[PDB]
Amino acid sequence: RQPPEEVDVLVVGAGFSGLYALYRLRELGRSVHVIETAGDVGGVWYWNRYPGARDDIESIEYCYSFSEEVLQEWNWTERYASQPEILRYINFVADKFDLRSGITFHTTVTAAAFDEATNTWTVDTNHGDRIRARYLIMASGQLSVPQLPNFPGLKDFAGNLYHTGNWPHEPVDFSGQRVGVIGTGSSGIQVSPQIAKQAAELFVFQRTPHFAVPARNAPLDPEFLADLKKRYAEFREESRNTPGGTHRYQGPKSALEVSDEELVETLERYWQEGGPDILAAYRDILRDRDANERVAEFIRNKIRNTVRDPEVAERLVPKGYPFGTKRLILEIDYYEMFNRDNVHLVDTLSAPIETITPRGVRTSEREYELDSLVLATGFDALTGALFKIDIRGVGNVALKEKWAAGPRTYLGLSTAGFPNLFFIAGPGSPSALSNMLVSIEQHVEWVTDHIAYMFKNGLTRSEAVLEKEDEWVEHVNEIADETLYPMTASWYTGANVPGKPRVFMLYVGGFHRYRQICDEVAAKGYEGFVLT
């Protein structure tokens, strides 16, 4: 589908973010078009088609709320939706609002440059398209550029190589194979139990163990759903008015104030219920090392009790960082998997990987021969997608250069020096620290409301004020430094990627507080922006 040469708004990306931007700008009477690398809609849910791929937020919360019809018509079937289901949902939405008519697929944005003479962006693609747009919305994701681990010999491996973030579109058959998985984040934890059912032998190459708690998935009772639908807009407002964008209970006590007995009984309740709600069991879990440690120990002990061989069990136990400060993962039959004779936990803290070889993986202790190797090694998060594009602001400043020591933004939404450019649910905003459908919807509404305001008032140039950006950055850093999150190497701090600057990238104050600030900024005529 040939993109238009001129448009009010150009949107990069056709995942949840870009699809809602497209729809809402259409409803606002603006010309808008999307460019997307993928062959079809869905973003993460299009790319991450590995077996076992599944959301870690309840289905009834991980969904769009902008359409009453969608909320009433769609039937989720389980507690946590699988990738195939979520992709059917996204297709449903795209069909319902005729969105593909406004999207060019199989096309990658390669560069974009602001023209101060015209107050427009000129955007290039890898098909030779040149598009001129007044406003540029980067809906290009947070976890959208797969990261390879930092090991030699990958190109020499003679077997089949996969990354979970670029999985094949046809099922992959691992029957009778010796298979390795590198990475035990959410992606490794989900894929490994599925591989284990086909492989002759599965080797799981763990570096730092990640905390994971049971999902306790279950079918969603259609009666509960029908009931929820009679108050769905209300239920969703309840979610928007929280720090996390879900119904998670905000435990009012301190993990230090309670007795050991009360702690165990309260944590046991969360462990049996399943899901990530334990993160908020007590108010200070992410704020006080000793509080955090009480919870962490309870979890570590549950992990130990899951695997019979106590040497294997102990190698599964996360150490050296606070519970919750790498993103909490939900597991289904992952720990149980290691009791199987054909699954092998390779502890690469103890025996670091030296190289990939034609046959497999060599650690400092031995060579593992493999027919296939699956990389669940994560993503170049938050900034990665943007840094693959040659984005140039005023005075030919490269975004990649301005952000070389970390992302610098006002509200996460724009950066000084780069007018008319907006980032959806990225650094400087709650982003992944909230249910992302809540984060995404609020960003899309705020940005598209702003663009509508500009057009209504006959303005053409919107730029974040440098001083306000510097004050925002410092503020993000100061509130993060009251938490334990900067203490740990995670993708939230860029520690994922050799050479990337280590700074915590997200707003930790909660979605609700962030939303209030955004509302106040807009109400005052976009204070901290200069509009002309």
Ligand SMILES: Cc1cc2nc3c(=O)[nH]c(=O)nc-3n(C[C@H](O)[C@H](O)[C@H](O)COP(=O)(O)OP(=O)(O)OC[C@H]3O[C@@H](n4cnc5c(N)ncnc54)[C@H](O)[C@@H]3O)c2cc1C
């Ligand atoms: C496997 C996985 C599971 C997740 N599960 C949850 C969860 O349970 N709960 C939660 O809150 N969040 C979770 N997320 C986080 C997730 O990023 C969001 O929930 C949301 O799906 C992001 O939507 P988005 O549209 O902002 O970005 P994406 O879904 O990443 O879509 C961005 C799109 O932009 C395209 N693109 C990027 N650069 C260019 C370019 N230069 N030119 C053209 N196109 C480009 C990409 O191909 C992609 O299709 C998960 C993420 C992953 C990776």
Ligand SMILES: NC(=O)c1ccc[n+]([C@@H]2O[C@H](COP(=O)([O-])OP(=O)(O)OC[C@H]3O[C@@H](n4cnc5c(N)ncnc54)[C@H](OP(=O)(O)O)[C@@H]3O)[C@@H](O)[C@H]2O)c1
């Ligand atoms: N259930 C879901 O909803 C779901 C599923 C998948 C992903 N997600 C989202 O996507 C995010 C990313 O998850 P992920 O599991 O893809 O990535 P990840 O959380 O970034 O984990 C990457 C894994 O790869 C290992 N790794 C990276 N580089 C390595 C190297 N050079 N050598 C050895 N190991 C290496 C890491 O070890 P170290 O920890 O030791 O670095 C870690 O085990 C999640 O946190 C979440 O936001 C959600």
